[PDB]
Every structure is written in structure tokens, then in C-alpha cells.
Design a protein around this nucleic acid. Structure first.
Length: 87
RNA sequence: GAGGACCUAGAUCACCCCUC
């Protein structure tokens, strides 16, 4: 556990942790007490289309935050790998 | 808070910044 954790979340997947108007992101912050900061649009890790997600706070809060987010991204991937994409 | 900027083939953009 550290006070600042970073994850790289594919761009087409980042909106899942942001949510409508950012209401999900805000939710995870209220629930964990940690601050989640996502890179600005168009800003990705070099040589990729992954947005940088920066989590900060107490070690316990940054770890819960990092876990719920990754869990959230992993949940999404599954649903997207099982179900048909609406268009 | 609300406009805006910044990116958008689809798969959510808060925070920061600007204006009030």
C-alpha cells in the first residue's frame, strides 16, 4: 500500500469508471475517501491509447479505490466479451 | 453550480483550466 497509485485504462473503457457526468468516478471517491484523477482527454501513456488514472489518499483508501476501479474495468471487459455491442 | 475549453468511429469525461 502506497498513498499514490496509478493504473492505465484503455480509452474505450475509461468512461465506465467515469459514468454519466462523472457521477461514477465521484461515487468511488465518496465510497473510498480517495481522490481519483484521470489524465486529460487525448493524453495517454506514450505508445498507447490508455488514459492514466491517478489515485491518491491514505494507503487504505488508495488501495480500495484502485481495487474497485480495476474490478470495474474487468467487469466491463467481460460483459463486452460476452454481450453484443449496441449501436 | 452553470456555461466553455480540451478530445470524440463506437463505449459515459469528472477533476484541473477559462467565464459568471
Amino acid at each position: 500500500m502506497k498513498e499514490l497509485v496509478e493504473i492505465a485504462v484503455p480509452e474505450n473503457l475509461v468512461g465506465a469508471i467515469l459514468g454519466k457526468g462523472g457521477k461514477t468516478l465521484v461515487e468511488y471517491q465518496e465510497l473510498t475517501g480517495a481522490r481519483i484523477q484521470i489524465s486529460k482527454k487525448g493524453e495517454f501513456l506514450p505508445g498507447t491509447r490508455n488514459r492514466r488514472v491517478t489515485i491518491t489518499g491514505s494507503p487504505a483508501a488508495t488501495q480500495a479505490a484502485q481495487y474497485l476501479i480495476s474490478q470495474r474495468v474487468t467487469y466491463e471487459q467481460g460483459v463486452r466479451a460476452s454481450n453484443p455491442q449496441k449501436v
